Symmetry: D2
């Protein structure tokens, strides 16, 4: 019932080898789990987000985003990442994203609190 509800739901892999498992709801919800292949992270972490459930019909991608806070039963990196991007459907479907990773810091170090990057997710590898 979302246009890309079906295209988005499932398992995605990025260039780092991380795994994003997501379910897209009819209404715009994203829920799932994230496992990072890098960094101070082990096992799965909860994720939540949103997507545009009625995208433009002119060949544009589907805007979406989601957040992981890097606390689970195993580790707590006192950090959260948000990914902002778009889903592009078709035989080589992709989710192209940029992300912001904020670490909790003291006020003195807050200038250095946020990393930025980019991840591309595919349905294989």
């Amino acid at each position: 019932m979302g246009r890309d509800e079906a295209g988005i739901t499932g398992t995605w892999y990025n260039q780092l080898g991380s795994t994003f498992i997501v379910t897209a709801g009819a209404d715009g919800a994203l829920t799932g789990t994230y496992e990072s292949a890098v960094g101070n992270a082990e096992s799965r972490y909860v994720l939540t987000g949103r997507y545009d459930s009625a995208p433009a019909t002119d060949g544009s991608g589907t805007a979406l985003g989601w957040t992981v806070a890097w606390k689970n039963n195993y580790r707590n990196a006192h950090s959260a990442t948000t990914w902002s991007g778009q889903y592009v459907g078709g035989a080589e479907a992709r989710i192209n994203t940029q992300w912001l990773l904020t670490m909790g810091t003291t006020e003195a170090n807050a200038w250095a609190s946020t990393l930025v990057g980019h991840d591309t997710f595919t349905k294989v590898k």
Copy 2:
């Protein structure tokens, strides 16, 4: 039961005059609504996110993030913003954030798909 569950839950206002109403769950969940004072937006939009429910005890802020997809019953801007930041408690409590706003685009225009900025939220104004 989250350390800052109580400090985060409520109504926050940014420098633009936008309003963020959020509830923080014991486990790390953020749910609420967002109303932008600017842009191609009207009324409230759903938001979801995550926060670190066991932050460092050394005066560091609390990492968190959340997403709004800019579709509601009134408008659809075919866009999503994610905010990444930290909550800082005390008499002048703040949520200091950076954000990424992705518009759905064609592949040809994808280079120009993402705006970046920064918002600071307070409990007054």
Copy 3:
């Protein structure tokens, strides 16, 4: 001879207490020195950049940017920051910027190579 050649040339201070001394050329050049109040930095570092020497006449700001590589005779942080922003003239003139700070890394750590932030520069403090 640049519209804001005169408004930009001089000494500017950001929210951190850093000092940016710049000369703007008629043709679009920015040259000067930068002294960071924070981080792995001591004394002055060379900076170079560019500005729009014929901005729009409708009350818009003046786009500009510049780079510092964090090597001088005292220290080498194996890093470079670029600021992208706009100059806004008038009784409270400002340069509002966002910045990207890249550290040289191994390929394995390149995902974590770039910090992002924002600085606002004024003619006082």
Copy 4:
């Protein structure tokens, strides 16, 4: 005389088909020209920047950055982009960057003034 003075000097091409011609100075200077394959741009634009002329010797990349203001004799987009990244040498040498593109805006629209992205440059294509 810079460690990567020779590796950086020359002609580079990004994923968009843009062309970056640069000379690296012994002391850390970058000078050259940029031609964008996309956007409101025609022909070459001046660029200036900086690089770390004494990078770490442990296989880390070489931090660098540069700026283009999008005014030349043909067009003026009232914008500037800064790229922040690192040079990685070897048989497949690359410059991996993130960038910030600021448009001059009114104060009311300044929230929407800055695009963010990422470009990867190679010596072929």
